[PDB]
Nucleic acid binder design. Structure first.
Lengths: 149, 206, 103
RNA sequence: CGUAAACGAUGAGUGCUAAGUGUUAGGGGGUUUCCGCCCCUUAGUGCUGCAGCUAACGCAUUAAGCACUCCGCCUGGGGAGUACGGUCGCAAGACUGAAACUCAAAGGAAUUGACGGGGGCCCGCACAAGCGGUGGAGCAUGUGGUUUAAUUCGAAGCAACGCGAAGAACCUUACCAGGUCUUGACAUCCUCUGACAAUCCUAGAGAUAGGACGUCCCCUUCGGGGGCAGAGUGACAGGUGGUGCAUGGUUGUCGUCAGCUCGUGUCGUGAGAUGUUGGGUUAAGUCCCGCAACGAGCGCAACCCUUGAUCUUAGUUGCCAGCAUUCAGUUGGGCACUCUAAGGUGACUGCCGGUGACAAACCGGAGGAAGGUGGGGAUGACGUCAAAUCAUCAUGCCCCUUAUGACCUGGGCUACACACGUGCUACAAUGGACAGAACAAAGGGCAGCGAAACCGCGAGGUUAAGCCAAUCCCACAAAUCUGUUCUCAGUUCGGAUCGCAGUCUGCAACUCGACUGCGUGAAGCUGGAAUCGCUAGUAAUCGCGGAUCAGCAUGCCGCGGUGAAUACGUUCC
């Protein structure tokens, strides 16, 4: 069988990042990169406006707050249902960070996902936020189950 | 759910069309006229052991070639055979019919005549081992790189009907350059219906 | 014959096949007929050849060892079957014996 | 007490009958005072092994060998080590020990399989990792029940249930009700006498008739012969009647799994084994190496079809690069380019390096359009489910025959309290509505495709160009992108249901068609237990096309448009 790997596209015409196009491919509903590109650039223009900063550094700070060190996997032996904590390899750190940004942004609820993604980045920058509940809770699940490693 | 017929599998690779023309405006009508032709000619020469009929359509004219493996039963005395054969076809089709009859040397390599030869022996109450083994020796001496004759039905045994393989040599139904003759025949016996499936791997083309 | 079939069907068929068939069918290649006798070097090492020799009732000459059975071999020679000079000596004597025979 | 799987499941004694090898307690020898090595012999205790034995497993000098002596015990399984009697025992029980009755087996050892909540290895959207759903609502569709005059029949876990049905208004259509028919609606017969047709009127729901009118057949040397018609007569027909547990043929499924076998040989009393196992390897019983096997066949792969690229030929109806004109590739012009369709070339672990046995193969590199069966398709081994199909067909047998057959109209297969598969549409801002701009592929068209114009709000309508089609049409692609607008509500969401008015198809849209126009606007605010699909141009989403077909598509079959997320891994199902 063996492990297979995938690829992704380097630039964005404004905000030249790999991972921002990785977020473009994420949150794509029904095969529409155009709508996700529109949502993303209008959101980052809100992040450049509402806070007078470049939104690249705010976006990496939000990622750094969300990227989880420790997943907690499963291990059922007998009738025990133990969860076992896993040191996450950093690709999955970035992609769990992007899932938590996208999911808790669209789960928030405001008058566009432009605004939801903007305010979720602004919350995950100054770490207290909705996806960071999931960050904290995964680290708490790894903290409770640390007896197994 | 099993094997695709090798005749229908190798059409348009190496095995030609039997029915060779091009459609103008009554393709269905030409088809069913030729089905009536093949029914009529195979009924009439199922005494005279005709295997295959290739039909042309040549702008109001039909060239029928007939592969028989004996000439003088079907071209015969010359006059009478071509009279009773071209004349009734000119009637029951409605236009000109020309008949060219190619004779199959090595009568035991064409699977239609071979399957009919096994079917008649079952109808002649010859045992269903003797038919297939005798015919396999006849075909493998007539020269074939493999033969497979499979007979199924009630073999003279009432409440269980089973399939019977006899074969010699390579019969490679998956090689798509094979030139394999496949042919069925049916044998209505007193105990029911027997089905003869013979296919003869004869040699491939590089 | 024709040496041009495919670019490598001569390889995958011919070469691969020549290797195994030459190495194993050796100099018994041109045998054409059943042999009269059989000269082996060790019966314990080669019970299969000794077995079907005694079955086919071919009389056998042979060097045996002290752990081998002299009842099974028709013509028993006691000597060294893994010292190369003793086996060279015995095959030498017997090949000279058969070379002195056809006249 | 007096019993144990109290066993070596192997009575005691004795003698004989190859070896190799540990070990326990002794003895003696050949050099050495020794340590210690070797040799030799006892008695006990292990293992492997020849002859011999055995049904085989195996035993084999510690016999299950070859013998002799003596003892104990067995004579199918159950009932049953039971009951009765006796002896012994405090007792529990022990020992001795049947019979009626009942069965055709019980049993040993071995072989092939299958299975294991046994071990090993491996693989697959199987699990995980994700992404989207189904289960909730509405509707479309199929199925169970139930209502029925009939709700025709067939399928029934995976492998039935948007299945046969690639199109139930009539037909189909079998089923029901009523009117009917009886060599018959369909095909060979026999005998005639000539054409059959065609229309009109009456019936009649129509079939079926009464009729009128009309019959023109022909071919020859005169007898006839190719039709069709009726008219008899009887052979016969006709069954979508039953049996898929009588069948042929054709399929599903395991499963595109990698297996399934045979020849000759040898092994075994035999069943069987061997090959086919073992090591590495593979997508693969693929391939190599070793091997009591050597081969072979069906499978696997390859050839076959498509897509990925380029060369030659071939440029019109296709293409517009430079040559000017054009509302327009329209014209002149050109085969460069795309395209098309033929022949090629091409990718083979071939070359490099590395590993591994040097093999087979594997990991990376260069080249290249293409890299390790490149993506897909077609191909479905021996056999498994007495799987499915007697309703596509052909069928053996059994049944019906003035009817279980045939015609005709009307209904039903669309019923509906309920469950239940598959699907479509939504519940909404990545949204809804309104306006502008663009980009496709593949396929269809002769009583068919139908431009343009005109009219109608619209579904569409009238006249009609072109097209048997790389020309002309279907054909104004849609999500998309760009502006305007609502602002998070059962709403500018959603469209069910329904009233009215229309349109098209067709004898005919009432049960029972699709579509339009106006209006009404429902359940529904992302779905419990449970559960499915997918590893890349895939899933998700968007339209287009075609079969079927007058008309009916949310189904199916293909086509493109945008177009992801994840695979640590085999712990678990």
């Amino acid at each position: 069988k063996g492990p297979v790997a995938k690829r992704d596209v380097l630039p964005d015409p404004i905000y030249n990042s790999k991972l921002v196009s990785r977020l473009i491919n994420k949150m794509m509903i029904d095969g529409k990169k155009g709508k996700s590109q529109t949502i993303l650039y209008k959101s980052f223009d809100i992040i450049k406006e509402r806070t007078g900063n470049d939104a690249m550094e705010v976006f990496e700070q939000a990622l750094k707050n969300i990227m989880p060190v420790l997943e907690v996997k499963a291990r059922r032996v007998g009738g025990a249902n133990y969860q076992v904590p896993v040191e996450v390899r950093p690709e999955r750190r970035t992609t769990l960070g992007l899932r938590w940004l996208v999911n808790y942004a669209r789960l928030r609820g405001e008058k566009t996902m432009e605004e939801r993604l903007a305010n979720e980045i602004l919350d995950a920058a100054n770490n207290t936020g909705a996806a960071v509940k999931k960050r904290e809770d995964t680290h708490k699940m790894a903290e409770a189950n640390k007896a197994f490693a | 759910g099993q094997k695709v017929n090798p005749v229908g599998l190798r059409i348009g690779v190496i095995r030609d069309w039997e029915s060779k023309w091009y459609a103008g405006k009554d393709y269905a009508d030409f088809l069913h006229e030729d089905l009536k032709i093949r029914e009529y000619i195979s009924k009439r020469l199922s005494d005279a052991s005709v295997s295959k009929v290739e039909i042309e359509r040549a702008a109001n004219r039909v060239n029928i070639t007939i592969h028989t493996a004996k000439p003088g039963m079907v071209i015969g005395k010359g006059g009478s055979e071509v009279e009773a054969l071209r004349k009734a076809l000119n009637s029951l089709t409605g236009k000109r019919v020309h008949i060219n009859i190619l004779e199959i040397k090595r009568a035991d390599l064409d699977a239609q005549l071979v399957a009919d030869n096994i079917a008649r022996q079952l109808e002649n109450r010859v045992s269903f081992r003797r038919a297939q083994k005798q015919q396999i020796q006849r075909t493998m001496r007539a020269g074939a790189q493999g033969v497979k004759t499979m007979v199924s039905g009630r073999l003279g045994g009432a409440d269980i009907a089973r399939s019977e393989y006899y074969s010699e040599g390579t019969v490679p139904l998956h090689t798509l350059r094979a030139d394999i003759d496949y042919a069925t025949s049916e044998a209505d016996t007193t105990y029911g219906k027997l089905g003869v499936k013979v296919w003869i791997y004869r040699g491939e083309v590089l | 014959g024709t040496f041009d079939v495919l670019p490598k069907k001569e390889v995958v068929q011919l070469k691969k096949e020549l290797e195994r068939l030459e190495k194993f069918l050796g100099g018994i290649k041109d045998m054409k007929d059943l042999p009269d006798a059989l000269f082996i070097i060790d019966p314990r090492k080669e019970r299969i050849a000794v077995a079907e020799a005694r079955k086919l009732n071919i009389p056998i000459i042979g060097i045996v060892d002290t752990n081998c059975d002299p009842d099974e071999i028709d013509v028993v020679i006691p000597a060294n079957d893994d010292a190369i000079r003793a086996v060279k000596l015995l095959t030498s004597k017997m090949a000279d014996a058969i070379l002195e025979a056809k006249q």
